[PDB]
């Protein structure tokens, strides 16, 4: 019957909202990582080069 | 009397919400593996 | 405000539960029960919904209340929408106007009332007083006393004050407005002295009184004068508001109201699905289709004539099922011959009942409260009056029919149809009565007597169908078995019933007929068999009621005969106009009393109605009394 149909009618749109929330919750996890990984590695590239050149320079000073 | 309705339809519905949640929170746990990974 | 649809409310019997259930369910109508024990526990309305309802109540009520103070109304119709907000808003300004003005009017009346009343005493005291409450050197105490009081008040004052006070008075009517004047320091004793006497310092209570007697007096002229005029305005506005806005007030009111019930209907079904009735919420799309048909058993809120009219109403009580034998519906056609035939009068009885009938069916303004009879105007309940407008016509037809029962009845007096007695006399037809004399009279005696018996026969036929088809075996056993007695009854009866015409077509027939009677009363056992005695008592009663309905009937025609025709001395001619001294008088008295006779048809009927001859009532028992069923 139709009564319980309204109970149906309520659930289906909620199934979709769990998903929409979820979708955003996977993506964000993904995106938090994207910037973070990229941003440290830059710094560690940077740092390693300087920690080299200045030595070689100081070596040139020898 | 269609009885069945009040004790059962209302369950079916619940379990449709339930299943959605499961696969869902997993997509996030999947992204967690990746979240670690990218930093690693 | 629920999910879209218009709520529909029905309640009815078990049979209509089903018919109704099917009718709502198929179209795409929602939240229907009884169709499961409580999946409307999964349609429990929100608190928000309860709140909206709550608001609707404030508005609904506010309209009614405001309508009341305003002094006009509105009445319930068929539900309609407007939006809550619009209605509340609509209700508010007017309620504010009417309310303010209503108070003002009340105040105005009071101002007038007090001021006029007080105007005279304050004036009398003032005239005497020549200003002294102005002064502190002298203090004055006004007080009113009657001259009943004067020697006593004077003694108390005298005793305290001596001559160190002035007691003066000028009359107000039935007493004198009086002053006791005292010096400052004497004040305390002065009040106490009057108090002992039982009089005391008098002026108006509250703020106005304190003012000089002279001042108060001025104000009294002014307030008294001012207030009726002022009252006119406040009253005018109010009247005006009622006049203009009444429709409006009602429309909001109706709108609101329809919601208050509608919302409630939803809440209860939500909650716990009730039973044999039927709920649902019905869409805008669905809504007419379900309503047009109704099968005649429920109660809703959406969102020739002589034989048919009261008879039509018994049709509704036919349709309900809740038991296994036929529903109670015969009554209206059982009523009708006698209803018309109660009036079987003569010149002043039947044939004058007409004046009333055209007055009532029509409109008569002759009356102090009755004006247009369609509008039910009465010193007695108005509401009650409106419904039986339908009846005024059926009664008018009764009045017409009773008149006819004057010429068939009048066969056995004058006229022609079974007798030959003059088709019409010359002086006063029905000068005296053929029926007063024994032979004619006798036939009428025997005539009622049979009719009570007839209603008994119908009842026991129904009785056996009842216990048979309802499977109330004790009752089945009773309806067939009780009939076993009867042949013997007829046996005994005949030797007195024709006297000489019969008595001997039967005899000691009773001795075997009495055995036939009791056989199955005894088969059920029944540890209370003697009790059948009372079933026999009803028969004598049925007879008596008809007999009286006749005899009191006959008496009615005969008052026109001792009231207009023949009586006095041995019975003489000039009695015609000696009685006319009385003649105008007997007519109205007669009218009042014959109304008493028609309650006897129903008294007869009442014998039958609760005697379980196809009935649900039995000193209560789930179903509405019969009392309510037959009236229109």
Swiss-Prot record, chain A:
Belongs to the V-ATPase E subunit family. Produces ATP from ADP in the presence of a proton gradient across the membrane. This is V-type ATP synthase subunit E. The chain holds residues 2 to 63 of 188 of the full protein.
